[PDB]
Design a protein around this ligand. Structure first.
Ligand SMILES: [Ca+2]
Length: 153
């Protein structure tokens, strides 16, 4: 079936920033292996003045090229989100075995005019978790089914 945890490291402590930096990791905590292509992660936030947006992995243990990004503007705003960044994995990311993790996934994202975000009104931001921990407001899915975290209400 599939059991996972997502770990999170905030690499931008300034609330005001042109670059959100939610580093991530997927841990397979169940008993079967999981194809990482089946896994999606969502970082829910408020855009703070809508613009084109770009997300980049500068480096990932599984190979940055294997990380996919999709910005989704939410149909309706919810508490601390009008967008999410959906992080996914190509076949090249491969399989996560029981008890193992992806290792580090670096992520940054910015608006195309480098205008500032405010991270303080972001559902998924955890300012102080600057090393890898459990940020339950970054949610994760297997085949589109929520398996980790709390989506914004
Ligand atoms: Ca915001």
């Amino acid at each position: 079936s599939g059991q996972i945890k997502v770990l999170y490291a905030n690499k931008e402590t300034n609330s005001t920033t042109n670059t959100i930096r939610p580093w991530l990791k997927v841990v397979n905590t169940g008993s079967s292996s999981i194809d990482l292509s089946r896994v999606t992660i969502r970082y829910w936030y408020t855009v703070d003045g809508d613009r084109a947006q770009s997300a980049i992995s500068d480096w990932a243990q599984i190979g940055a090229s294997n990380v996919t990004f999709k910005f989704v503007k939410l149909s309706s705003s919810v508490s601390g989100a009008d967008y999410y960044l959906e992080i996914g994995f190509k076949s090249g990311a491969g399989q996560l075995q029981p008890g193992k993790d992806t290792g580090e996934i670096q992520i940054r994202f910015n608006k195309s005019d480098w205008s500032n975000y405010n991270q303080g009104n972001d559902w998924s931001w955890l300012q102080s978790m600057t090393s890898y921990g459990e940020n339950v407001k970054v949610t994760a899915y297997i085949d589109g089914v929520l398996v980790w975290g709390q989506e914004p209400s």
